[PDB]
Amino acid sequence: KLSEVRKQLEEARKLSPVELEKLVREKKRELMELRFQASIGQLSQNHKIRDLKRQIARLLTVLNEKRRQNA
RNA sequence: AGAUGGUAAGGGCCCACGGUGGAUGCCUCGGCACCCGAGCCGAUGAAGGACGUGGCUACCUGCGAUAAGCCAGGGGGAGCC
Incomplete structure (x- = not known):
């Protein structure tokens, strides 16, 4: 996990604004898909969700630090 | 014609062992006083709230649709959610 996290950020950090959005x-959509499965029980392994959640945060966090200078 | 003995439905006093009840002693994440230190927040939206937030979550806690958490700098070193 930790290893990948730092990579996400590196690549994302240089990804343009329009392309980030x-x-x-x-990603948001993938989340929906994942809750639907959670609800039916049938396929669903926990950590997968809080993971995908923290992704979006980071993605959005980055989107903002850009906006503060570039639009 | 004569006599003090003898029964316990129940009751009383004493002794032994239990029941109820929570005094006593010992204990303390709490309180009280004094002395020091420190002393404002808010339209860049306060103090105080409402609703919401976990894969499963009644309440408390923490957070706010990025929701028990997002970024970076510093501290620490084997255990965390």
């Missing part, structure tokens, strides 16, 4: 929408 769409990466997020996409």
Whole structure:
């Protein structure tokens, strides 16, 4: 886990503003998919959710530090 | 024609062992006093709240749709959620 996290950030940090936004929408959707499965029981292994959640935060956190200078 | 003995439905006093009840002693994440230190917050939206937030979550706690958490700098070193 930790290893990947730092990488996410490196690549994301240089990803443009317009391109980020769409990466997020996409991620957001994956989340929905994951809750639906959670609800039915049938396939669903916990850590997967809080993970995907913290992703979006980071993604959005980055989107803002950009906005503070670039639009 | 004569006599003090003898029964316990129940009751009383004493002794032994239990029941109820929570005094006593010992104990203390709490309180009280004094002395020091420190002393404002808010339209860049306070103090105080409401609702919400966990894979499963009644309440408390922490957070706010990025929701028991997001970024970086410093401290620490084997255990965490």
